[PDB]
Amino acid sequence: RTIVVTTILESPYVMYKKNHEQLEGNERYEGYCVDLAYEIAKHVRIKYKLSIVGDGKYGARDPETKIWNGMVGELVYGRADIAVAPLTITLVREEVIDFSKPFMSLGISIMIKKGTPIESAEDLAKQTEIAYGTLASGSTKEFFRRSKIAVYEKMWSYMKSAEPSVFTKTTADGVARVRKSKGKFAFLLESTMNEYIEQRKPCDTMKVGGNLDSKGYGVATPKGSALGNAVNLAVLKLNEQGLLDKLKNKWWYDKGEC
Amino acid sequence: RTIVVTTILESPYVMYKKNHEQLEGNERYEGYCVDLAYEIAKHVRIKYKLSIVGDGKYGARDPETKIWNGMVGELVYGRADIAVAPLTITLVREEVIDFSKPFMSLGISIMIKKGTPIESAEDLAKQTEIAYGTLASGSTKEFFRRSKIAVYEKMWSYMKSAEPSVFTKTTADGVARVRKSKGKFAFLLESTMNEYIEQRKPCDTMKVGGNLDSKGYGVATPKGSALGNAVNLAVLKLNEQGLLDKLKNKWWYDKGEC
Ligand SMILES: N[C@@H](Cn1oc(=O)[nH]c1=O)C(=O)O
Numbered sequence: 001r002t003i004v005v006t007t008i009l010e011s012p013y014v015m016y017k018k019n020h021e022q023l024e025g026n027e028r029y030e031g032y033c034v035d036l037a038y039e040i041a042k043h044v045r046i047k048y049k050l051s052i053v054g055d056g057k058y059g060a061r062d063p064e065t066k067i068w069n070g071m072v073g074e075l076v077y078g079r080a081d082i083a084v085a086p087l088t089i090t091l092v093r094e095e096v097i098d099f100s101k102p103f104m105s106l107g108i109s110i111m112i113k114k115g116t117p118i119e120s121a122e123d124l125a126k127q128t129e130i131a132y133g134t135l136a137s138g139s140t141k142e143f144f145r146r147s148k149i150a151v152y153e154k155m156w157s158y159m160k161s162a163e164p165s166v167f168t169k170t171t172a173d174g175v176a177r178v179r180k181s182k183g184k185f186a187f188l189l190e191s192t193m194n195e196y197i198e199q200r201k202p203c204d205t206m207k208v209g210g211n212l213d214s215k216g217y218g219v220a221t222p223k224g225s226a227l228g229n230a231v232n233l234a235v236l237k238l239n240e241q242g243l244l245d246k247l248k249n250k251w252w253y254d255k256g257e258c
Numbered sequence: 259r260t261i262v263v264t265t266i267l268e269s270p271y272v273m274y275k276k277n278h279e280q281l282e283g284n285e286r287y288e289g290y291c292v293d294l295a296y297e298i299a300k301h302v303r304i305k306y307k308l309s310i311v312g313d314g315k316y317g318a319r320d321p322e323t324k325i326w327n328g329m330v331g332e333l334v335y336g337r338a339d340i341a342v343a344p345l346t347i348t349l350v351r352e353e354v355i356d357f358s359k360p361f362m363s364l365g366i367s368i369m370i371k372k373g374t375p376i377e378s379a380e381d382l383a384k385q386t387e388i389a390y391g392t393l394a395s396g397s398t399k400e401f402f403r404r405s406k407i408a409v410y411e412k413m414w415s416y417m418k419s420a421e422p423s424v425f426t427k428t429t430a431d432g433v434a435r436v437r438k439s440k441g442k443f444a445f446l447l448e449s450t451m452n453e454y455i456e457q458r459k460p461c462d463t464m465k466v467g468g469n470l471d472s473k474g475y476g477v478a479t480p481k482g483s484a485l486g487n488a489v490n491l492a493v494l495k496l497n498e499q500g501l502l503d504k505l506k507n508k509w510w511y512d513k514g515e516c
């Protein structure tokens with residue numbers, strides 16, 4: 001009866017409240033996805049418990065052991081009933097879990113330290129003074145790994161072999177590295193996170209260029225789960241009432257610091 | 259074995275080729291959705307026949323007779339196996355048919371005759387010299403009808419009662435009316451169609467402001483159809499190969515006239 005909602009600590013989707021160490025259960029967290037889980041549960045009519053994913057990952061399949069990790073894994077092996085998180089809808093994931101229709105649209109983008117002389121992936125690709133990388137595992141990394149498009153192949157060729165590693169274990173790590181690199185590191189990440197970060201102090205980063213692709217985040221459910229249908233209707237409803245747009249303004253722009 | 263693909267004459271999704279009167283079957287048409295149906299059928303491995311929807315509509319339910327019209331209707335009453343068209347994913351539709359994940363993202367937008375003094379829905383709403391309207395039936399009209407947001411309620415209040423009607427039976431009609439109105443008519447339509455039109459001669463229209471919402475088009479299938487699953491994977495695949503982006507450039511921007 002109390003359903004497990006797997007999620008992931010990633011601002012501003014899910015965040016520790018300032019006095020969290022003194023709080024319990026759901027009250028520990030706030031963010032866009034905390035609000036969204038609340039709204040969804042209200043329409044689906046369920047009680048639920050947020051659970052930050054143990055391995056801190058999104059979800060990829062180990063090519064060796066065939067095993068799925070991250071939030072995906074939590075749904076594939078039955079430890080969670082639903083994932084409300086910035087989980088990217090992809091072909092490989094969609095073969096093993098279900099996704100609602102997108103609650104947010106987005107694409108991969110480039111984050112630079114202000115002043116950095118880079119406007120496009122082409123600008124990054126044709127040079128080697130400025131390093132660049134992506135979250136160590138996630139759909140962004142995969143986009144590069146799988147692309148057949150020359151510029152992206154070049155970038156992947158460089159990233160996969162660069163030393164030290166240019167991959168990071170979290171978004172926050174990538175951002176820190178951009179901020180600390182005096183313009184000598186650019187980070188490849190989703191436009192959503194990129195835009196959030198751009199609106200926060202010290203206001204020293206910016207998104208440059210267009211997005212590289214066009215995709216979305218879906219609320220995810222175990223394959224053939226009988227919550228799937230309701231959750232999907234619930235998402236469309238919420239989008240149609242303009243609630244999704246309201247929550248986006250609330251967590252990104254309303255409090256923007258820049 | 260030969261499956262019926264319902265679609266709709268709407269540039270540049272589906273269009274008569276210049277020598278169509280001399281051609282037969284699928285060869286009569288070209289466009290983004292003609293290309294997309296081709297790609298999908300190739301991955302799903304089916305033979306198919308495009309069929310322009312008889313009533314020229316997208317799909318709404320007659321509140322009186324409960325009957326569904328347009329492409330939706332063609333799927334609900336079994337006359338078509340799939341719809342490959344700029345069909346907007348909505349809550350009411352999703353209750354009666356299935357949609358793949360979005361193949362294109364978009365939102366409602368404002369089309370003006372260049373020079374018209376309007377930058378936002380708020381600008382339209384607060385005045386009455388410039389008339390404005392939407393496709394006579396479609397999700398855009400419905401957005402206005404259902405909104406609880408003050409500005410949109412105002413607009414709907416004005417549109418529903420305006421004389422002569424401000425609704426049009428086709429996109430093309432709305433565009434013509436903007437072009438013929440010397441700036442005294444603005445048209446509410448999806449950003450996709452708006453952008454296409456902006457790139458065509460006489461180059462006298464433009465999109466102004468942000469979109470009013472954020473949604474997408476899905477390939478649609480009869481509810482519980484066993485083509486649904488393949489079509490959905492097929493869409494994600496195509497997006498992941500960058501084919502969807504390539505077709506968008508092909509039909510909108512590559513040949514842009516402005
Ligand atoms: N939403 C992404 C995770 N991730 O966040 C980014 O910004 N890049 C990236 O790969 C996923 O679902 O894998």
Ligand SMILES: N[C@@H](Cn1oc(=O)[nH]c1=O)C(=O)O
Binds near residue numbers: 316345346398399
């Ligand atoms: N895609 C829309 C049809 N339509 O096209 C527009 O530009 N507005 C509008 O309502 C639908 O599926 O109802």
Ligand SMILES: [Zn+2]
Binds near residue numbers: 016020021
């Ligand atoms: Zn703490």
Ligand SMILES: [Zn+2]
Binds near residue numbers: 274278
């Ligand atoms: Zn003709």
